[PDB]
Enzyme design. Sequence first.
Site, mmCIF file in Angstrom:
data_model
loop_
_atom_site.group_PDB
_atom_site.id
_atom_site.type_symbol
_atom_site.label_atom_id
_atom_site.label_comp_id
_atom_site.label_asym_id
_atom_site.label_seq_id
_atom_site.Cartn_x
_atom_site.Cartn_y
_atom_site.Cartn_z
ATOM 1 C CE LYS B 16 -2.370 -1.049 3.685
ATOM 2 N NZ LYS B 16 -1.568 -2.287 3.861
ATOM 3 C CB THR B 17 3.239 2.603 2.441
ATOM 4 O OG1 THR B 17 2.225 2.512 3.459
ATOM 5 C CG2 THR B 17 4.006 3.903 2.718
HETATM 6 N N1 LIG Z 1 9.299 -7.109 -4.964
HETATM 7 C C1 LIG Z 1 8.412 -6.159 -4.645
HETATM 8 N N2 LIG Z 1 8.372 -5.762 -3.398
HETATM 9 C C2 LIG Z 1 7.507 -4.802 -3.040
HETATM 10 C C3 LIG Z 1 6.594 -4.261 -4.042
HETATM 11 N N3 LIG Z 1 5.823 -3.369 -3.400
HETATM 12 C C4 LIG Z 1 6.234 -3.306 -2.112
HETATM 13 N N4 LIG Z 1 7.265 -4.171 -1.919
HETATM 14 C C5 LIG Z 1 7.933 -4.409 -0.632
HETATM 15 O O1 LIG Z 1 7.046 -5.042 0.327
HETATM 16 C C6 LIG Z 1 7.231 -4.518 1.630
HETATM 17 C C7 LIG Z 1 5.972 -3.848 2.172
HETATM 18 O O2 LIG Z 1 5.494 -2.689 1.422
HETATM 19 P P1 LIG Z 1 4.675 -1.574 2.100
HETATM 20 O O3 LIG Z 1 4.417 -0.636 0.937
HETATM 21 O O4 LIG Z 1 5.164 -0.863 3.328
HETATM 22 O O5 LIG Z 1 3.312 -2.564 2.416
HETATM 23 P P2 LIG Z 1 2.065 -1.898 3.216
HETATM 24 O O6 LIG Z 1 2.070 -2.310 4.728
HETATM 25 O O7 LIG Z 1 0.927 -2.572 2.493
HETATM 26 O O8 LIG Z 1 2.147 -0.409 3.374
HETATM 27 C C8 LIG Z 1 8.416 -3.563 1.495
HETATM 28 O O9 LIG Z 1 9.705 -4.237 1.666
HETATM 29 C C9 LIG Z 1 8.316 -3.116 0.052
HETATM 30 O O10 LIG Z 1 9.523 -2.478 -0.421
HETATM 31 C C10 LIG Z 1 6.676 -4.763 -5.399
HETATM 32 O O11 LIG Z 1 5.917 -4.384 -6.324
HETATM 33 N N5 LIG Z 1 7.602 -5.719 -5.640
HETATM 34 MG MG LIG Z 2 1.978 1.010 4.775
#
Ligand SMILES: Nc1nc2c(ncn2[C@@H]2O[C@H](COP(=O)(O)OP(=O)(O)O)[C@@H](O)[C@H]2O)c(=O)[nH]1
Ligand SMILES: [Mg+2]
Lengths: 356, 385
Positions: B16-17
Amino acid sequence: KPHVNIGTIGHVDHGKTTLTAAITKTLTAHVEYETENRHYAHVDCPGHADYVKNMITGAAQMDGAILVVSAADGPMPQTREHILLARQVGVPYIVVFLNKCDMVDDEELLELVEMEVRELLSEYEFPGDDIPIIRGSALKALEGENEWVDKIWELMDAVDSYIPTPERDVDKPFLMPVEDVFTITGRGTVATGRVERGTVKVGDEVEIVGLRDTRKTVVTGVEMFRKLLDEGMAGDNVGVLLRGIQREDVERGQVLAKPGSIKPHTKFEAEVYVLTKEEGGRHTPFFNGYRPQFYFRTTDVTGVITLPEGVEMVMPGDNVTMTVELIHPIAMEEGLRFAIREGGRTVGAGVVSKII
Amino acid sequence: KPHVNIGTIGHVDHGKTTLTAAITKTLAAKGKAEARAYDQIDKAPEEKARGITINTAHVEYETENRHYAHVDCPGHADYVKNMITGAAQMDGAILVVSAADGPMPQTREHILLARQVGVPYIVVFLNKCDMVDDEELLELVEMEVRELLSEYEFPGDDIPIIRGSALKALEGENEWVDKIWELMDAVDSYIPTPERDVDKPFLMPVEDVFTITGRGTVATGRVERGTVKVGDEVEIVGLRDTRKTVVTGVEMFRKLLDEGMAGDNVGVLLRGIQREDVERGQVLAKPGSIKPHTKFEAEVYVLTKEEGGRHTPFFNGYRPQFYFRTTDVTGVITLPEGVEMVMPGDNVTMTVELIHPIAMEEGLRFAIREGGRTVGAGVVSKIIE
Ligand SMILES: Nc1nc2c(ncn2[C@@H]2O[C@H](COP(=O)(O)OP(=O)(O)O)[C@@H](O)[C@H]2O)c(=O)[nH]1
Ligand SMILES: [Mg+2]
Ligand SMILES: Nc1nc2c(ncn2[C@@H]2O[C@H](COP(=O)(O)OP(=O)(O)O)[C@@H](O)[C@H]2O)c(=O)[nH]1
Ligand SMILES: [Mg+2]
């Protein structure tokens, strides 16, 4: 009226919590209070690891400390530990409150304790012969005796005048950690970030410091999206355009800075606290040759740790002075905080204590 | 030009972020947003819905078509509270699902909450397609997401599912960046533009009623939606049988106005109405636009002790006060099948039956109160006739 962050350090039971209360009545339990010319935020931790972690990674960052020393006991080992720590994490000034003077009336005995406190402060590198030592009784002051309430006033006058109000971030030499670098279509390359300190205006020279050899160029734009052109300052999120700089020439983790104001280094000593499992760290210890990631402002760089002579490991919840050698240079000064990460876990919090 | 509230929903660590950061950077490269640092959106500040703390990040950006205010939140508990009682209702949501994990339990809960709070439309970003080139696995994940959306009555066959990588887009890889553009086109096309409050049908909650010598019987309140002026027909809806009458005047600071507008604190004078004919908790409304009801389903966040709420659970049949706009009305709670006890801090679906009708519609927020404190925050999710 200016604001200053301070707190109480010194050995257990010497009187920090009582002094803290006597100060508030006169005029990590945070309190605020004010003097005639200054507002204060004040921390008083309940012993042990709480001091270590507020001082390495706390909400505030102490602009000065009140060392509480009991006249009845003299300096004890946590008195020493706290002075050493203060030096390590960059506490800039110390005032002493010689407490429990209601229990010790021999002037000769008070001067002995005073001599030893000054010597102990000077054995780290505080100026022991110039630090104010205020004789007092926090207990008798809290209990209303006008004699001892007067010395809380003397302490707070000495705090007002000896612990300078910290330099405001806007007055410091310009520094902006580069968060990202990209091209705006139809325009050119921008380096974005939040200005940490100082001010920048179009036409200023800056250096791009860290990761690679330093280069100097001129600022051709400063933009806060749909709000501001030509200047920026501490706290602003800006895009900066730079003469002759493409994406190959500036990257995340470098800093933009006033020329000469900060240098890149690979090697330093730091004071590090190792997080517990419960704090998000690992249950395993640090060791010599451990090669985790070091997070300084907006990037992370591998570094190899060496522990002090004859220390083989450092257990979670413990702290130590470590030497670090990074695989790339990073802009850094003494007093700069950093995180130590490995995998997706924060395993350590540090502050640069000396540059090599 | 039109303004739209959206946000990113989905299970922890699905991206998400990183998507939110990638959108701001993508549009920033075209002079259409401020690029926002992941760590600044990720370390979201605290916002304070009355004793409740919600960690909420706000970003703004525009496409060729619209302005977006976009919310993103660190934890599941923030989404719970944000969706049920956060400062901005979402006009649409972007559901982020990791193609490497598939739907997870917060995937379900967020789709369920979107349904309960009336989120009009969901678009899906199937994330981390850089980790997954098996075309069998992709189509499987998309079929599961579609089935899950359909389970909560979203149009799972119509909904767009963009296959991308938030991380590669944020890094600047052009082919993945294209998928951010494909997402923003799906947002622009599928998420409807919300109606403005002033174009909605007149509604004002009644706060107080009294008589003004030489003027008539006045009902005070703050206009919530629409407008009101002398000569308009209004209904008086809730608590007793609906009555229709004519507005004989609108006053603010004891002076007669041309018109009252969404936002104004006014007194509305009412034709042929004595002081006992109208009461606190009724609404004045455009005739036909709102109906009185006693029975409804709701999604409810139950406050913790620390937020000012209860310190013990409640059970099936709990009969607290339901505070709708300006007045409390007693109601009986029926808990769903399988739910027997509700703890401080829980969020649950319930059925309620009020002792008097209230003007209501789907989406109307309310508090649950007991002994003069707020113990719950709710949204009306379904009217039951
Ligand atoms: N390989 C890959 N990793 C991702 C992608 N999007 C997010 N990540 C990784 O997954 C983890 C969580 O992402 P985050 O955006 O903070 O998830 P949120 O809790 O949903 O906000 C982090 O290490 C990101 O860098 C993607 O498209 N590909
Ligand atoms: Mg987040
Ligand atoms: N006689 C005397 N006792 C004190 C004085 N200040 C504190 N104490 C007492 O010594 C004990 C330890 O005090 P405290 O403030 O908790 O120590 P801390 O561990 O440094 O915070 C308590 O019983 C206090 O009330 C003082 O000025 N005179
Ligand atoms: Mg104490």
